Each structure stands twice: as C-alpha cells, then as structure tokens.
Coordinates of C-alpha atoms in Angstrom, one line a residue:
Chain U
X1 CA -9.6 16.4 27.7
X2 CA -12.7 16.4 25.8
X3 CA -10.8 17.0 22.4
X4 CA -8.6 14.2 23.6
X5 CA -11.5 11.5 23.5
X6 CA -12.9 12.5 20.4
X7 CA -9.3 12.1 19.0
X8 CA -8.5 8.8 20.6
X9 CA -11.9 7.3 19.5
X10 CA -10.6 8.6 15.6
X11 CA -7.3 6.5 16.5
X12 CA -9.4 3.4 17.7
X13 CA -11.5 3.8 14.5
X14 CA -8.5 4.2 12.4
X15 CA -7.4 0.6 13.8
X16 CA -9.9 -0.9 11.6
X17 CA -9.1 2.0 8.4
X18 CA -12.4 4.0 9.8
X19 CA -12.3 7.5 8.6
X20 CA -14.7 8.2 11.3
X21 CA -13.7 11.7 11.5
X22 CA -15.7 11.5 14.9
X23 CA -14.0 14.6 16.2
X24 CA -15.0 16.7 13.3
X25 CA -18.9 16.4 13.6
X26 CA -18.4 16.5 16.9
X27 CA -16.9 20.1 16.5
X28 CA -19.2 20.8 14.1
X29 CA -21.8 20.6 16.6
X30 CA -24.7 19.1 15.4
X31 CA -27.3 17.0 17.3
X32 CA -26.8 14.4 19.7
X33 CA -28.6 12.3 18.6
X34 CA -27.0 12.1 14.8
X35 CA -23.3 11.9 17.2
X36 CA -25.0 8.7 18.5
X37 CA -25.5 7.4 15.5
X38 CA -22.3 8.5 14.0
X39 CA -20.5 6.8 16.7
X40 CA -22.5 3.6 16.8
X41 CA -22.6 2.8 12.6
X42 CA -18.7 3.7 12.7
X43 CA -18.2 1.2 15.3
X44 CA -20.1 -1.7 13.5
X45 CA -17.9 -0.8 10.7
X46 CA -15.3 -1.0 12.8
X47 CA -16.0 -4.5 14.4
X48 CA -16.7 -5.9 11.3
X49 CA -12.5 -6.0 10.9
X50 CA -11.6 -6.4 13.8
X51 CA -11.8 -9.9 13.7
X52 CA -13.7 -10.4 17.1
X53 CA -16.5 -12.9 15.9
X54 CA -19.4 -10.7 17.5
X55 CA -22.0 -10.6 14.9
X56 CA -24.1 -12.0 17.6
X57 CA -23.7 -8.6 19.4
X58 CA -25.4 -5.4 19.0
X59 CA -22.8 -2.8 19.5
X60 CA -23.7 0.8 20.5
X61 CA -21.9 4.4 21.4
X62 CA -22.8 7.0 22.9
X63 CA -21.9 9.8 24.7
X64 CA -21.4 9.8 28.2
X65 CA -22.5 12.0 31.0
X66 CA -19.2 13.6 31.9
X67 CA -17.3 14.3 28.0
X68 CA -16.5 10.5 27.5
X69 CA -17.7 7.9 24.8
X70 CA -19.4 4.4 26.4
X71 CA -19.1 1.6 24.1
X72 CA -21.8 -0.8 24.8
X73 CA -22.4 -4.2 23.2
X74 CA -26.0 -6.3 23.6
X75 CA -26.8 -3.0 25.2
X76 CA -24.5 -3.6 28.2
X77 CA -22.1 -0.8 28.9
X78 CA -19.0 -2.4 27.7
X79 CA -16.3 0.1 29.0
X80 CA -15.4 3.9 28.2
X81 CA -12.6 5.3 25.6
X82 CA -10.9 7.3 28.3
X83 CA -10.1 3.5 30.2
X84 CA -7.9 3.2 27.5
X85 CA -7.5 0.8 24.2
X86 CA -6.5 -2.1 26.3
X87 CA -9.4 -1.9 28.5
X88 CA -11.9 -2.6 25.6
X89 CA -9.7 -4.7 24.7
X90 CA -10.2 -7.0 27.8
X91 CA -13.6 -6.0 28.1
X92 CA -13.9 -7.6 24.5
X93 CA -11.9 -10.7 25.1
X94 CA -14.2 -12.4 27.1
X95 CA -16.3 -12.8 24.5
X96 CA -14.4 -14.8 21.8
X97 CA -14.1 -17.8 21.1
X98 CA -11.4 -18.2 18.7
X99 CA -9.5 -21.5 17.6
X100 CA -6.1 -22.4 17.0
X101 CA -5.5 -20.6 13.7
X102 CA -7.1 -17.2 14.7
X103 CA -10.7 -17.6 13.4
X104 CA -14.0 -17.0 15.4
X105 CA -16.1 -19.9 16.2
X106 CA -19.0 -18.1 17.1
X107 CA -22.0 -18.2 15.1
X108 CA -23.8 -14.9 13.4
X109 CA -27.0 -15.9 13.9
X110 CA -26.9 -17.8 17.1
X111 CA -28.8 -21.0 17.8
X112 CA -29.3 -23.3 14.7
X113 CA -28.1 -25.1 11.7
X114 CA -24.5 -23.9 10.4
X115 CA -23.4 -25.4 7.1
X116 CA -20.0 -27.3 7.0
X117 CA -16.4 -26.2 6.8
X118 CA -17.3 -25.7 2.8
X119 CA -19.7 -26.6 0.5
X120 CA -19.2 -26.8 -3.8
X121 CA -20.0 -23.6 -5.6
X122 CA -23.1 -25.7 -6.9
X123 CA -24.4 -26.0 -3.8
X124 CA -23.7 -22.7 -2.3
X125 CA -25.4 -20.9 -5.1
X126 CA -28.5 -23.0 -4.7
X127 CA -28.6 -21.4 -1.1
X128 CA -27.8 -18.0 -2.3
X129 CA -30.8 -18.0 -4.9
X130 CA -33.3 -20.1 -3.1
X131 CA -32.7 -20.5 0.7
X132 CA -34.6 -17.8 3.3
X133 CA -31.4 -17.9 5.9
X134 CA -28.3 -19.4 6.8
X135 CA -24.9 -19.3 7.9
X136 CA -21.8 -21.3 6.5
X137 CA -18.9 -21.9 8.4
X138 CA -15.2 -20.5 7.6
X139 CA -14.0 -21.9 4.3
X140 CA -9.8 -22.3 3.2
X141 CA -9.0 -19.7 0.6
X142 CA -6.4 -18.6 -1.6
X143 CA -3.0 -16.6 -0.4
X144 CA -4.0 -18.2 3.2
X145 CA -7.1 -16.3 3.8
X146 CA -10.4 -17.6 5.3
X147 CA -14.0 -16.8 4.4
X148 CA -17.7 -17.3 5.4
X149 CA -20.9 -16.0 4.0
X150 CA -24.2 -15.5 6.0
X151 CA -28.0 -13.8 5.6
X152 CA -29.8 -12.0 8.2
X153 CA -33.3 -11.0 6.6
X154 CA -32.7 -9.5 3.4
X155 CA -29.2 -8.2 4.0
X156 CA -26.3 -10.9 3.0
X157 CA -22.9 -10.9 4.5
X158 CA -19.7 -11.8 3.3
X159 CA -16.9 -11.8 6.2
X160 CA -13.1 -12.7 4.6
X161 CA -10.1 -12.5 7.2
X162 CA -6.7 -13.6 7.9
X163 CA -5.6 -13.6 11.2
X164 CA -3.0 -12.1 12.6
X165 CA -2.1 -11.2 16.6
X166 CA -1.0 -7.5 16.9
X167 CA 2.4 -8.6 18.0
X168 CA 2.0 -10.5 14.5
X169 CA 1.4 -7.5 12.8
X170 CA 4.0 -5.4 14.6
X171 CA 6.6 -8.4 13.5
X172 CA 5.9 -7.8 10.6
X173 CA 5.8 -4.6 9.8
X174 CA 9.2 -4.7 11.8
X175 CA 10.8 -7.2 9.4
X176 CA 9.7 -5.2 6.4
X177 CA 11.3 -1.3 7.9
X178 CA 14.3 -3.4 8.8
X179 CA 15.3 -3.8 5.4
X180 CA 15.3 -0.1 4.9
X181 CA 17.7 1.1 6.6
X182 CA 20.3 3.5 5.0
X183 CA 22.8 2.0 7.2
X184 CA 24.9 -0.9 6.0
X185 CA 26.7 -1.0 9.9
X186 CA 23.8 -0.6 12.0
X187 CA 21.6 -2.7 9.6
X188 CA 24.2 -5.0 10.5
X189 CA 24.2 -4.7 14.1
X190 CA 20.2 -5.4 14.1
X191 CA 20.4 -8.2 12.1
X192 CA 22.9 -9.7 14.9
X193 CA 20.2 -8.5 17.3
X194 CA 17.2 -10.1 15.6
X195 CA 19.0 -13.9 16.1
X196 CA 18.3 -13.6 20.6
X197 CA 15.6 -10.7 20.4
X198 CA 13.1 -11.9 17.5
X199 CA 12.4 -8.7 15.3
X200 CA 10.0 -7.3 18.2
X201 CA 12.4 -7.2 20.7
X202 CA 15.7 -6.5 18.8
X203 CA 14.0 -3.4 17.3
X204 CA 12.8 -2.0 20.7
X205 CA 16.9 -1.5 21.3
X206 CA 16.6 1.8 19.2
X207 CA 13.2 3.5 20.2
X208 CA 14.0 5.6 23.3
X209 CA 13.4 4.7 26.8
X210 CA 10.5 3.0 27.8
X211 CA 10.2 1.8 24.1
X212 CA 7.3 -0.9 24.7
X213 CA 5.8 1.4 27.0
X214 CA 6.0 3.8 23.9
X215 CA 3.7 1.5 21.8
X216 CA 1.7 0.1 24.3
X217 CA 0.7 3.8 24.4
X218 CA -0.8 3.6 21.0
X219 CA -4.0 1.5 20.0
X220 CA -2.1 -0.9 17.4
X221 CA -0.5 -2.9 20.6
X222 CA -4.1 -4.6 21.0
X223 CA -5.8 -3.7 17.5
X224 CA -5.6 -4.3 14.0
X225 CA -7.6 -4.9 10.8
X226 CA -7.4 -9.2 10.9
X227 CA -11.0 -8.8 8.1
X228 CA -13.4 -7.1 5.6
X229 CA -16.7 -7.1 5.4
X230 CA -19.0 -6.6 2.3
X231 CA -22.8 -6.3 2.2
X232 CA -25.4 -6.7 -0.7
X233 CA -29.0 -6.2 -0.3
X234 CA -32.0 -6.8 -2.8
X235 CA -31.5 -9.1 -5.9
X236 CA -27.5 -8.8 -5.3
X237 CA -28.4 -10.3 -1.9
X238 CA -29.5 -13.3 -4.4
X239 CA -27.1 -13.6 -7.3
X240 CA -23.7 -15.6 -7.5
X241 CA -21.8 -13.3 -9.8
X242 CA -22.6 -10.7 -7.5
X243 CA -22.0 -12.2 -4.4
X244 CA -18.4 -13.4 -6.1
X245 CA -18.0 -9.9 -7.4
X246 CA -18.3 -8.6 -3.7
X247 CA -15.8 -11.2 -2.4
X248 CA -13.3 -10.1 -5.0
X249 CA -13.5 -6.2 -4.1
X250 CA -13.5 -7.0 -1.0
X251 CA -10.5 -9.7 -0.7
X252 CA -8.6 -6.8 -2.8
X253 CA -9.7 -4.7 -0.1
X254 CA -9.1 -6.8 3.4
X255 CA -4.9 -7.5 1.5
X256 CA -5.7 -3.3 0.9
X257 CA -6.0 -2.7 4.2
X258 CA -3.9 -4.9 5.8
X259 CA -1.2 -3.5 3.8
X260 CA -2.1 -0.4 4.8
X261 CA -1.6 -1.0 8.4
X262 CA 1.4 -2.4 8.3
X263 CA 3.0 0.6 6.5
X264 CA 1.1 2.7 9.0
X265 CA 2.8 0.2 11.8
X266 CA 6.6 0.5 9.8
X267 CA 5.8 4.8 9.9
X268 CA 5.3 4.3 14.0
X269 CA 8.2 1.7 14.2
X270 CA 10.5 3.9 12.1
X271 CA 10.0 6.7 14.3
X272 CA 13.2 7.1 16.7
X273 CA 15.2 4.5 15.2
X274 CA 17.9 6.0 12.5
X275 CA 19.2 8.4 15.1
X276 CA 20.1 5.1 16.8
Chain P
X1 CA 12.7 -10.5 -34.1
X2 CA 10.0 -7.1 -34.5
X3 CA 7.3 -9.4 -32.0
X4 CA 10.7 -8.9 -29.6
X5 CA 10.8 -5.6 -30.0
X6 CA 7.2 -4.9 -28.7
X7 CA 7.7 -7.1 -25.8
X8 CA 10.4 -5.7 -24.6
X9 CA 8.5 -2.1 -24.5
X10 CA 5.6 -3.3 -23.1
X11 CA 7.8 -4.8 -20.0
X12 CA 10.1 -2.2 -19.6
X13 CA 6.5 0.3 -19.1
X14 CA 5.4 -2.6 -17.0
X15 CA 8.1 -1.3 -14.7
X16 CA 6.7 1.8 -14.4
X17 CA 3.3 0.1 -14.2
X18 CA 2.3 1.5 -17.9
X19 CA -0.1 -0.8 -19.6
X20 CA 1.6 0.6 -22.9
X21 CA -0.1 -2.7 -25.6
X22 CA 2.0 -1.6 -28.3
X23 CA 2.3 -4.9 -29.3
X24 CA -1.3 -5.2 -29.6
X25 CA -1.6 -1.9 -31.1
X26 CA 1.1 -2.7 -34.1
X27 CA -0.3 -5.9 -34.3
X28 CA -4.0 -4.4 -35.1
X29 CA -2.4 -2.9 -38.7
X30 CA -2.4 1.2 -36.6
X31 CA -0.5 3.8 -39.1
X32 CA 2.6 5.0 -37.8
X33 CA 1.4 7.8 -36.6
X34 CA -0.6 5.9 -34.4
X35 CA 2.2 4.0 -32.9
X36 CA 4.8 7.2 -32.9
X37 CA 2.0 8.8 -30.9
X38 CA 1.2 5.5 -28.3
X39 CA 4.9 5.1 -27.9
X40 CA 5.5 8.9 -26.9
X41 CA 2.8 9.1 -24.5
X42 CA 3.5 5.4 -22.8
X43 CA 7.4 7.1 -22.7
X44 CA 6.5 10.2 -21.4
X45 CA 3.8 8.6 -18.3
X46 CA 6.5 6.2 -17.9
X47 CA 9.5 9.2 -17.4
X48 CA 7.1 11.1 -15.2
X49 CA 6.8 8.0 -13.2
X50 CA 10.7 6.7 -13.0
X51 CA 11.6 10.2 -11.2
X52 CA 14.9 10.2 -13.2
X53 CA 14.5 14.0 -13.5
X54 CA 13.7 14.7 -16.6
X55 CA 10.4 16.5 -17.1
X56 CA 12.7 19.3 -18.7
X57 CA 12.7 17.2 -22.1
X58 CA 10.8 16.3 -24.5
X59 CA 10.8 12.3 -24.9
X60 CA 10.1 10.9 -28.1
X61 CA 10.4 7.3 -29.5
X62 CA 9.8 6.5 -32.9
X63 CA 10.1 3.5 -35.0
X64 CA 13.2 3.3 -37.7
X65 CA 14.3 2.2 -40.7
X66 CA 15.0 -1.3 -40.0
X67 CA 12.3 -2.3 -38.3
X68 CA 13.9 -1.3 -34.9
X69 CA 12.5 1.6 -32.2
X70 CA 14.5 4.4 -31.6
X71 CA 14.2 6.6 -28.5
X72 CA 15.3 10.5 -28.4
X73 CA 16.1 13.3 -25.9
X74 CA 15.1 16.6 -27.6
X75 CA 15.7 15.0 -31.2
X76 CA 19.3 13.2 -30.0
X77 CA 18.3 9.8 -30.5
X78 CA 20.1 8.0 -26.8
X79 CA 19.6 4.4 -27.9
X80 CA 17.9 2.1 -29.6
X81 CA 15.6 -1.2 -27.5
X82 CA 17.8 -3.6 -29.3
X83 CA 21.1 -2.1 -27.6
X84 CA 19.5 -2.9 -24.5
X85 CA 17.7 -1.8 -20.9
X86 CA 21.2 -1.2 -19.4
X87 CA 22.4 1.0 -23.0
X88 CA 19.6 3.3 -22.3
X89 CA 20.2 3.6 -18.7
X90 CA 23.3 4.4 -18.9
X91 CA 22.6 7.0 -21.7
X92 CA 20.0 8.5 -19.5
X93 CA 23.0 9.2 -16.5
X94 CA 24.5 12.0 -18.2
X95 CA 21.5 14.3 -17.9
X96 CA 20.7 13.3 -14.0
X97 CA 21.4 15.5 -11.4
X98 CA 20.6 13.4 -7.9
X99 CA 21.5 15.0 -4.9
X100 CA 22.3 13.0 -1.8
X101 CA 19.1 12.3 -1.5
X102 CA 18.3 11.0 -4.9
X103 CA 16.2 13.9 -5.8
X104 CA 16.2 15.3 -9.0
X105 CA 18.5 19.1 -8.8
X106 CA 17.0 20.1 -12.2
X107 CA 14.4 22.6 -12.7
X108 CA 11.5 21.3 -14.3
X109 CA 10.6 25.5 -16.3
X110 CA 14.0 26.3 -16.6
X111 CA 15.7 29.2 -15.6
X112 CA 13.8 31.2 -13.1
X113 CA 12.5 31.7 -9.9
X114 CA 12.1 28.6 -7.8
X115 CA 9.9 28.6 -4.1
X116 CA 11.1 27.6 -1.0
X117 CA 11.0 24.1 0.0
X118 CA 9.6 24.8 3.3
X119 CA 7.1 27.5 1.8
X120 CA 3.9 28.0 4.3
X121 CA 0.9 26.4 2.5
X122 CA -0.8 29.8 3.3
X123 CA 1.6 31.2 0.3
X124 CA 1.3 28.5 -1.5
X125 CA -2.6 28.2 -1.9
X126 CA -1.9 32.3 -2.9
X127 CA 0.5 30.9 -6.0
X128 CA -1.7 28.1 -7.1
X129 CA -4.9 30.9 -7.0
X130 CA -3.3 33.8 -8.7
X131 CA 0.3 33.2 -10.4
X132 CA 0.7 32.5 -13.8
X133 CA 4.0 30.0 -14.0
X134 CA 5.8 28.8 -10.9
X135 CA 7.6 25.9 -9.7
X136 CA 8.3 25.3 -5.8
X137 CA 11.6 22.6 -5.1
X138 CA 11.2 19.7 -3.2
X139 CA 9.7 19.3 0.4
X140 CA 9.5 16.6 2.4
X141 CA 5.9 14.9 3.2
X142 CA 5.4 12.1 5.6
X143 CA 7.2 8.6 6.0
X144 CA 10.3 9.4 3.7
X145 CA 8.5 10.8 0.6
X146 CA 8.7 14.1 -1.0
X147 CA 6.6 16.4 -2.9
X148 CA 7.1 19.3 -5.6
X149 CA 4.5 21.3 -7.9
X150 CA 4.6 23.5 -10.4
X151 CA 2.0 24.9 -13.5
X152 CA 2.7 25.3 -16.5
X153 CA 0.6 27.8 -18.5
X154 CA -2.7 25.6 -17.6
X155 CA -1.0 22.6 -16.6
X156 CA -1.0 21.8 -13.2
X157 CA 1.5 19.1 -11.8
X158 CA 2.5 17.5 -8.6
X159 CA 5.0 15.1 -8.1
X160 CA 5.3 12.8 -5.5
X161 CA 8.7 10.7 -5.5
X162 CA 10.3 8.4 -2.7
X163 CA 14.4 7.6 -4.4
X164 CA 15.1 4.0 -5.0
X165 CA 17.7 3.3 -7.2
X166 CA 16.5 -0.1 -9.0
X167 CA 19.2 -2.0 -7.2
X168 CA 17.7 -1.0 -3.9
X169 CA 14.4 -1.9 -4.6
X170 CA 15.6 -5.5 -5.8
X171 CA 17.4 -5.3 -2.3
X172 CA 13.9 -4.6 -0.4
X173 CA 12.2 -7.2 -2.7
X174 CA 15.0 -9.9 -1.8
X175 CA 14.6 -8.8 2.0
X176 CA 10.8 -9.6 1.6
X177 CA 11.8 -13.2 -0.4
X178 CA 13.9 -14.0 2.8
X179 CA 11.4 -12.9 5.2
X180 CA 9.3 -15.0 4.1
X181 CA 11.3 -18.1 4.4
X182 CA 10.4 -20.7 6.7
X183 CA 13.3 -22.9 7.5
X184 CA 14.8 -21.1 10.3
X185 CA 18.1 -22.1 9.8
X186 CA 18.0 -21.0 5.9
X187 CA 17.1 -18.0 7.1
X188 CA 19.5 -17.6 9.5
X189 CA 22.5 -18.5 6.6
X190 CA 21.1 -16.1 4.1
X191 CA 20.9 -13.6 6.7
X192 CA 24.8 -14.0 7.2
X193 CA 26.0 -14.3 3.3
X194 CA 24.1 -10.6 2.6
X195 CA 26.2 -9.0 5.4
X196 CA 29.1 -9.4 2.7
X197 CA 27.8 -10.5 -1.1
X198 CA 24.4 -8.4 -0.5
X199 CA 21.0 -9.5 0.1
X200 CA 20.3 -9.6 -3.4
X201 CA 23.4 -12.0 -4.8
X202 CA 22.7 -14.2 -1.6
X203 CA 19.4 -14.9 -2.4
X204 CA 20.5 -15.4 -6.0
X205 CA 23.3 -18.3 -5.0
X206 CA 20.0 -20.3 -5.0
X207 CA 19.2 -20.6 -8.2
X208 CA 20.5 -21.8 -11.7
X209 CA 23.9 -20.6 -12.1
X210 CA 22.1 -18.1 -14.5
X211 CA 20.7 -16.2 -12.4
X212 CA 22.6 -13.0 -12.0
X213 CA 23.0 -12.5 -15.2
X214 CA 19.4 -13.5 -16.6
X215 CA 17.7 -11.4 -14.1
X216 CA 20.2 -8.8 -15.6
X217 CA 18.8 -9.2 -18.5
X218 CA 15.0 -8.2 -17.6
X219 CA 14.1 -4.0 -17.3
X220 CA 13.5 -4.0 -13.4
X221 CA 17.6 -4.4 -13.6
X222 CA 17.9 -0.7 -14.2
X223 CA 14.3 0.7 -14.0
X224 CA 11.7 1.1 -11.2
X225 CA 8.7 3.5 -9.8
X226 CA 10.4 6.6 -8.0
X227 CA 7.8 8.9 -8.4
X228 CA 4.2 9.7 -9.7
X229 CA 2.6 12.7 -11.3
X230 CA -0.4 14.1 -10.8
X231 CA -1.9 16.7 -13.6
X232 CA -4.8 18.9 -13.2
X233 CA -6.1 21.5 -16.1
X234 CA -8.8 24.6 -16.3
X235 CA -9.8 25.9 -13.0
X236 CA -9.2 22.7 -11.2
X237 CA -5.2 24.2 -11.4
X238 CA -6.3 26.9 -9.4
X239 CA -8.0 25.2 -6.5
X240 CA -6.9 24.8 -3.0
X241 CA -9.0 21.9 -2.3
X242 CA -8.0 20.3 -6.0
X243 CA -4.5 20.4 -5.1
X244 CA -4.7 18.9 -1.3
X245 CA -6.8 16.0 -2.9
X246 CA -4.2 15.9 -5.8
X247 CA -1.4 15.8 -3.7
X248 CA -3.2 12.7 -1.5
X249 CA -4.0 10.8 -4.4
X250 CA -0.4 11.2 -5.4
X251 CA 1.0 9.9 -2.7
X252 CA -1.4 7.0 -2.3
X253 CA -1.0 6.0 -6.2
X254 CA 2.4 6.1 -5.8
X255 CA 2.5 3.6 -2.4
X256 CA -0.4 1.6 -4.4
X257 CA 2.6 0.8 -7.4
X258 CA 5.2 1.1 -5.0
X259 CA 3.6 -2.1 -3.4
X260 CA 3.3 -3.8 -6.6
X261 CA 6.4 -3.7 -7.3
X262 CA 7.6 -4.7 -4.4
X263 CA 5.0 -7.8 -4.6
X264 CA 5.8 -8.8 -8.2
X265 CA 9.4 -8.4 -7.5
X266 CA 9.4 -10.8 -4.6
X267 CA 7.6 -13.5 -6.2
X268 CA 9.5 -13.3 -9.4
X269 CA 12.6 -13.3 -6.9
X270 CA 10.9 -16.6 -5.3
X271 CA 10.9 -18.4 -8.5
X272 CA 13.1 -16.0 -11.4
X273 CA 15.1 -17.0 -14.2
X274 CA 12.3 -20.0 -15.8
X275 CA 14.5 -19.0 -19.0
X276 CA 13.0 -22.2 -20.7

C-alpha cells in the first residue's frame, strides 16, 4: 500500500519521461525533508511537459500523514496520488485555459505586458541581451510545433510543445502498432474495423474484457508529454546562439520524447492483442 | 563512373546509419591502405548492424583493378558495387541461417558450448565475471526485441536485434506515409488496394510509373537496421553493472536508428523517385 504510492507516483512521473526513481530514495530512507524536495523539483520537471500552462503556479509534494503523497499547487492541497491519476487530472483542469489548437493562454509571469504572437529574430535578440523581463506569446514553428520564451529574474525559459489530447496520443500510437501485425487475416479484419470504430475503438475489440477500463487504469488515459522545457542562467540567459542552441536540444528532445511515449503507448496497446 | 562508386557505398552504409565518407576520404588523395582499411571497418559496423548473421566472418572490401570495389567473405570475393545492391544480397542468402523468427541460427565462436537462452542473470553475471570465452543464444527482452552476448578473448559484445526483412520495414514506412494522409477518402481507397497489391505497391500506384522499379534501385530495397552491437574491452567486459548499462544503451541505440529509418523512409516514400 505504501510501496504502491511510491510506485504509482514513479508511473505519473514517467508520464512526463521523469526518471524520478521516487520509490528508490524513498527505500533508501533518507530524510524527509530531501523526500520533500525530491518529490516537489521532480514534479516541476514534470509539469513543465505536461502542457498545463501553470508557470503561474508554485507546485509542491509532500508526504502525507497516513503513507500518501499531497500534491499541492500555490500552496493549496491540490489532491493526493492514491485518488487516482484522473483525480489530479480534474483537480488540474480547472486551471487551464487552453485555446482551440491545444496551447495555454495563461501567462508565466502573470499581470503585464506579453509580446505578440511573434516577433523578428532582430527584435527578439535585442530583448534577450538588453531587456530585464518579459514574456512572448506562443510563436508557429517548424514540423507543426509551437514555442514561447520568457525570463523570471536571472533564469530564462524556453517552453516548445505540440499538443496532442491523450486520446490523440493513444490514436496514434494505435495507428502505428497496427501496421505490425504478423497477421495478414487479422490485420485484415482490423482494418475493416477501423472504418465504424476509429483506431481507438476498433483496437479495444482485441484487449480482453473491460478493455478501456484496462487503460483507463493506467496514467497515459489522462497524461502525456504534449512539451519541453530548457533553462539557461547567467550570460547564456543573455546570448542568442545560446538561447537557439537550447531550443534546438531541446526541440530534438520534446520529438525525443514524444516518440518515446508513443512506443511506450504501442508496448501497453500491443499487450493482449495477437492472441486475438 | 569512380564518383558513382563512392556514392553508392556511402548510401548503402547510410542504411545502416554508417557515416562511412569514403567519398570524401578518396577524394582527399588517402593511400589505399587508408581506404582498404575505412571500407573494412564502415563494412564490418555496417554487418554488425544489418543482423544478417554473420559476425562468424571476416568482411573485407577492397578496391580492384579497374577502378571498381570488391567485397569478400573470408577471401571469396561475393560481388562487386557495380553488380548491384540486389547481387550482393542475394550472395549474402547462402550463408543465412534465419529461424522463424528471423534470428540468426549461427554461432557467432564457432563450435562449442552455447548458454541457455533463458539463463538466470544470477549465472550470467558469474560468466561475464570469471569465464574466459562464452557465447549465450538469443533471449527475448521487452516489446519484440532480443538480446545475445558473448566475449571474445577481451572483447565484450552484446547484440540487440528486432527482425525486419527490408520489405517489411518499407511496409511499416508506407503504413506511416498512409497514416498520415488527410483526405479521408484517399485513405480509405489505399487502405483497400493493400489488402491485395500490399501496402507498399499501393502507395507506389501514386507515383511516376517509375516508381517500383527506381525505388528498387536504391539500397533500403534489400538493406535495413536489424540489430546493433555493443562492445566493451579491459575490465569493463567483466562488469555486471558495464553490461546492464550496455545492454540499455543497446537497445535504445537501436530504437534511436530504428526510428530514423522509419522517419527517412516515410518521407522519401511521400515524395520518392525525383529521378531528375
């Protein structure tokens, strides 16, 4: 029961390709206090993918009286891992304030100026080299991707994402195992399915009983990586080739790790089907 | 007709993503010592790579009399690049032993003992300690792949292959062209043409009648990444911990080129023949 938290905060962290290895330390036994802070920088991390659009948040976690983990965000107790995924999940949703194509509106640093939907490279690295703080709004990017770039103090962030739903991601990583299959008949027999079902539903014919209940089970029915983060501090904080440098790492890294959870959705997908 | 010659091994490595620049390297006046040697070690990463089976040979390509390059099996020259990708595919089959899997059957030290393919990693840590010369068969490791290791005097090596014929991986690349289609009802007719011409000829009956037969023509026709190789030397070969985070960075090299493939195979798919 206790192991089981521990192991199903590692599962939520490894929604947003956090090693957090939260149950490790935890065996490990060190101080509380360094589990706090464990728990808390992993989520950050974590949040920084997720795509929610709360940088104007401070989230926090902590252990809880009874064995459990509290999430908390602005210091209000948010909910409690053993509530289950989709209960952070609601307890998060309030809080959005997405558009039509999948991209926060919120701002980063609150109240105040935002700069427009994009600005010339000219202009943006005037800002970069000269400007105390600011925040820029989300920017069209290559391969469909969206980006933004803001400073709080001396620390400057670089957010890129491309949204996707969870049911987006499970479609897809559905219409990718599809085309797998070592089965010309039954390959066959799905593709007839796929034409009234959509690949969601005309794959959830060959998991066993209670199929969506199945994956509903599992975090990825309300999580997935949808954006990466990087950070640069000092002088790098200030410098366009640096600042570009970091948003090509790290736009390798967001199609990285969206890759990545896609194959990890195909593995969960593929299991229970071939027997089928 | 020499700059051909170059080009053609430099692509044909590119589908086993070798960087091999012999072109560059002939082109810089190297001896032909130099080039024998590039050649033999681009080959060799390259065979290691294709998982055709064949670590039991020595590869060696050379350049001949007449300008051309001539590859050999243990001194028996197979074929020549002139004669063409499908020539030296088809004079690599004799030696393959596939199983039903598409696993190579041949032993990689030759005659003698062999471990388990379900040996407990408790025994196996035991071998890798304190044996001299030992080679385990194949095992299976998570989402289809499988894994096999073996050292040879102070060699260390670990395979980690998932079979694809090259004609299957066109098929998974075409699946991924379609998938990303977005007339519905394109789709839906492309969808219905695989189910008897394959996925692969359907997409190609949109295309210059060429087609087909240029895209024969280029190396991913009978070439593509099966496997990947791992080597480790000194005391590093007789590490536990060395060969758990060899075996990882296997298996994530080889979904990493795995994925490129699959990538650059789609979007070559998407657009293709260009013969000019």
């Amino acid at each position: 029961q206790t192991d089981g938290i521990y192991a199903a905060f590692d599962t939520l962290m490894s929604t947003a390709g956090v090693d957090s290895q939260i149950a490790a330390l935890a065996a490990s036994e060190a101080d509380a206090g360094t589990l706090d802070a464990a728990l808390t920088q992993s989520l950050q991390e974590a949040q920084g993918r997720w795509g929610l659009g709360l940088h104007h948040l401070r989230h926090e976690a902590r252990l809880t009286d009874d064995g459990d983990i509290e999430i908390l965000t602005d210091g209000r107790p948010s909910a409690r891992v053993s509530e289950g995924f989709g209960a952070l999940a609601q307890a998060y949703a309030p809080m959005q304030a997405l558009d039509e194509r999948g991209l926060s509106q919120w701002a980063a640093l609150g109240e105040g100026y935002r700069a427009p939907g994009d600005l010339p490279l000219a202009q943006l690295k005037v800002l970069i080299e000269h400007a105390r703080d600011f925040e820029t709004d989300w920017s069209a990017g290559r391969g469909e991707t969206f980006q933004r770039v803001w400073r709080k103090g001396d620390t400057l962030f670089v957010e890129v994402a491309r949204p996707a739903s969870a049911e987006a991601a499970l479609s897809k990583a559905a219409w990718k195992v599809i085309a797998s299959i070592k089965d010309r008949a039954f390959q066959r027999e799905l593709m007839r399915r796929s034409e009234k079902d959509g690949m969601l539903g005309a794959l959830l014919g060959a998991r066993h009983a209670g199929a969506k209940a199945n994956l509903a089970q599992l975090p990825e029915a309300h999580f997935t990586v949808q954006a990466f983060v990087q950070t640069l501090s000092g002088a790098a904080a200030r410098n366009a080739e640096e600042y570009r440098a970091a948003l090509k790492t790290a736009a390798a890294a967001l199609e990285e790790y969206q890759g990545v959870t896609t194959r990890q959705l195909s593995e969960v997908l593929r299991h229970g089907l071939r027997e089928s």
